[PDB]
Design an enzyme around this catalytic site. Sequence first.
Site, mmCIF file in Angstrom:
data_model
loop_
_atom_site.group_PDB
_atom_site.id
_atom_site.type_symbol
_atom_site.label_atom_id
_atom_site.label_comp_id
_atom_site.label_asym_id
_atom_site.label_seq_id
_atom_site.Cartn_x
_atom_site.Cartn_y
_atom_site.Cartn_z
ATOM 1 N N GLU A 51 -7.441 38.698 -22.181
ATOM 2 C CA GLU A 51 -8.102 38.845 -23.459
ATOM 3 C C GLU A 51 -9.045 40.047 -23.422
ATOM 4 O O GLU A 51 -9.714 40.296 -22.409
ATOM 5 C CB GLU A 51 -8.900 37.562 -23.731
ATOM 6 C CG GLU A 51 -9.676 37.501 -25.031
ATOM 7 C CD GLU A 51 -10.607 36.287 -25.077
ATOM 8 O OE1 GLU A 51 -10.548 35.416 -24.173
ATOM 9 O OE2 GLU A 51 -11.450 36.236 -26.012
ATOM 10 N N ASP A 71 -21.427 37.591 -8.774
ATOM 11 C CA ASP A 71 -21.519 39.027 -9.041
ATOM 12 C C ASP A 71 -21.704 39.290 -10.525
ATOM 13 O O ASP A 71 -21.060 40.179 -11.088
ATOM 14 C CB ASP A 71 -20.314 39.805 -8.488
ATOM 15 C CG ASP A 71 -20.600 41.314 -8.347
ATOM 16 O OD1 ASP A 71 -21.784 41.705 -8.343
ATOM 17 O OD2 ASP A 71 -19.625 42.080 -8.275
HETATM 18 N N1 LIG Z 1 -11.342 41.581 -20.245
HETATM 19 C C1 LIG Z 1 -12.020 42.708 -20.493
HETATM 20 N N2 LIG Z 1 -12.277 43.030 -21.776
HETATM 21 C C2 LIG Z 1 -12.987 44.140 -22.015
HETATM 22 N N3 LIG Z 1 -13.510 45.007 -21.131
HETATM 23 C C3 LIG Z 1 -13.240 44.668 -19.859
HETATM 24 C C4 LIG Z 1 -12.501 43.548 -19.443
HETATM 25 C C5 LIG Z 1 -12.440 43.594 -18.010
HETATM 26 C C6 LIG Z 1 -13.133 44.692 -17.625
HETATM 27 N N4 LIG Z 1 -13.626 45.361 -18.737
HETATM 28 C C7 LIG Z 1 -14.448 46.572 -18.716
HETATM 29 O O1 LIG Z 1 -14.224 47.259 -17.496
HETATM 30 C C8 LIG Z 1 -15.453 47.324 -16.731
HETATM 31 C C9 LIG Z 1 -15.155 47.201 -15.261
HETATM 32 O O2 LIG Z 1 -14.693 45.915 -14.874
HETATM 33 C C10 LIG Z 1 -16.323 46.226 -17.316
HETATM 34 O O3 LIG Z 1 -17.711 46.463 -17.014
HETATM 35 C C11 LIG Z 1 -15.955 46.295 -18.792
HETATM 36 O O4 LIG Z 1 -16.559 47.391 -19.482
#
Ligand SMILES: Nc1ncnc2c1ccn2[C@@H]1O[C@H](CO)[C@@H](O)[C@H]1O
Length: 327
Positions: free
Chosen positions: A135, A178
């Site tokens: 998602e 974390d």
């Molecule tokens: N499921 C998600 N939906 C939207 N953005 C996502 C995710 C998973 C990660 N991120 C973005 O990537 C950065 C590094 O994990 C995170 O800090 C975040 O900016």
Amino acid sequence: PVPFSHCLPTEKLQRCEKIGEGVFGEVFQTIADHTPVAIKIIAIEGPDLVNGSHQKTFEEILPEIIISKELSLLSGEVCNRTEGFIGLNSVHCVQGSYPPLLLKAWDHYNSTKGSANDRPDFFKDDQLFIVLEFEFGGIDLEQMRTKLSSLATAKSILHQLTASLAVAEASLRFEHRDLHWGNVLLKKTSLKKLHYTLNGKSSTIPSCGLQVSIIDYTLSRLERDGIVVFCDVSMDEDLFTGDGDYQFDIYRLMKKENNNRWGEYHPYSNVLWLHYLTDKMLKQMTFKTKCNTPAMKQIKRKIQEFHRTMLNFSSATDLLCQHSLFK
Ligand SMILES: Nc1ncnc2c1ccn2[C@@H]1O[C@H](CO)[C@@H](O)[C@H]1O
């Protein structure tokens, strides 16, 4: 293993834009069936350094896969139910060199935001990756530092985070381990109230127009039926030697709490991260509207009181159920 084209058929690949990164790898946003998704791509099993670190083996990446599934499933459970993690759509093991279209997206991000990573253009056609499709959770709290309306929003965020962690404690003996502010995602919602259930008791949280999702389970721990899934960082040097942010003290404080025994359950680590996040809300976040109503100035005092009292609680469950902030 499957080719990249299995996960990222042409139109989906063409719509990929890079949205995030870490030493672990890369995160892209794309769209399918009119719905945005986040695609996390992690190189595994190879001998090359990637972003300065060795690649995880399949055995080392399995905990994150398992935990991502368990936390996603909480949205559809009954006695312990929350939507405050992130949905997991699929997980694939892919083999091949990095798609040129993803390198194009990687370059655009490097040109505009800048990257700390290596350009991922050195992989051969036998390279394995894990591709996790989640998602799309919105924008991280760190990138929203100057974007939120008021401390009222902060209260909703802390309440949502605490409730989610409590539900996961109750069902899974979960510790995030974390939960820095890059791992708190914020998305607009038209819902006025969000719903959770903790040990069969349902309640609601005023949304202030945002739904929170907790992401990134690379250091997380949980258990089911006495089988513990976790990341053993007992011999990690560098994790405990950071400075310049309270974030890096949290790793040290976790290690003090658990006596460097990472398989054990210490839900106080969730309280530590919640304290770190409350500290960010009070010290580094900056709001468009400062508190200038008696109701808002009371909200500020209550969040300050949470900051100075919450470390005397044993778990996110204890905070949710007993702290005056949530009454
Ligand atoms: N499921 C998600 N939906 C939207 N953005 C996502 C995710 C998973 C990660 N991120 C973005 O990537 C950065 C590094 O994990 C995170 O800090 C975040 O900016």
